[PDB]
Amino acid sequence: SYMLPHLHNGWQVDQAILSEEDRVVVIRFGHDWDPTCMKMDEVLYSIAEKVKNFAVIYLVDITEVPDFNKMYELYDPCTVMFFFRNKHIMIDLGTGNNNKINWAMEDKQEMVDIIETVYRGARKGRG
């Protein structure tokens, strides 16, 4: 089961997005034996509990998760995505130059920066 909570089901995903009960939510799409995921996951452990009370990340594999396959939906190595207010928002784990985080590169540095603006920015309130 590991630490970083995962998810692979339309019922758990469609419900998880709305079942935040905190603030935001992070989701990763790729493979269990993916390199880009190994790097991102490494940072998660350091940037998880730090604000888990507000944000709720969830790993996902582009094979077990029935997120509309169509026929050849697969093509990209890996990538991350954030969800807030039950909406799909494009937020990179820690863009170093450009393009989503498919190659993975930021560690607990670029991440903490983005997560700080996302977790705090995607609050929707008046705190």
From Swiss-Prot:
A Gene Ontology term for the protein's cellular component: nucleoplasm
Cystine pairs: 37-78
Gene Ontology BP annotations: cell division; mRNA splicing, via spliceosome; RNA splicing, via transesterification reactions; spliceosomal complex assembly
UniProt-reported outcome of changing residue 37 to A: Viable when expressed in S.pombe
Alphabetically ordered keywords of this record: Cell cycle, Cell division, Deafness, Disulfide bond, Mitosis, mRNA processing, mRNA splicing, Nucleus, Phosphoprotein, Spliceosome
Localization in the cell: Nucleus
Superkingdom: Eukaryota
Database matches in InterPro entries: Dim1, Thioredoxin-like_sf
Modification after translation, per record: The disulfide bond seen in structures determined by X-ray crystallography and NMR is not essential for protein folding and function.
Primary localisation category: nucleus
Pfam families (alphabetical): DIM1
Family per record: Belongs to the DIM1 family.
Subunit structure: Component of the precatalytic spliceosome (spliceosome B complex). Component of the U5 snRNP complex. Component of the U4/U6-U5 tri-snRNP complex. The U4/U6-U5 tri-snRNP complex is a building block of the precatalytic spliceosome (spliceosome B complex). The U4/U6-U5 tri-snRNP complex is composed of the U4, U6 and U5 snRNAs and at least PRPF3, PRPF4, PRPF6, PRPF8, PRPF31, SNRNP200, TXNL4A, SNRNP40, SNRPB, SNRPD1, SNRPD2, SNRPD3, SNRPE, SNRPF, SNRPG, DDX23, CD2BP2, PPIH, SNU13, EFTUD2, SART1 and USP39, plus LSM2, LSM3, LSM4, LSM5, LSM6, LSM7 and LSM8. Directly interacts with CD2BP2.
Disease tied to this entry: Burn-McKeown syndrome: A disease characterized by choanal atresia, sensorineural deafness, cardiac defects, and typical craniofacial dysmorphism consisting of narrow palpebral fissures, coloboma of the lower eyelids, prominent nose with high nasal bridge, short philtrum, cleft lip and/or palate, and large and protruding ears. Intellectual development is normal.
Protein name listed in UniProt: Thioredoxin-like protein 4A
Species per Swiss-Prot/TrEMBL record: Homo sapiens
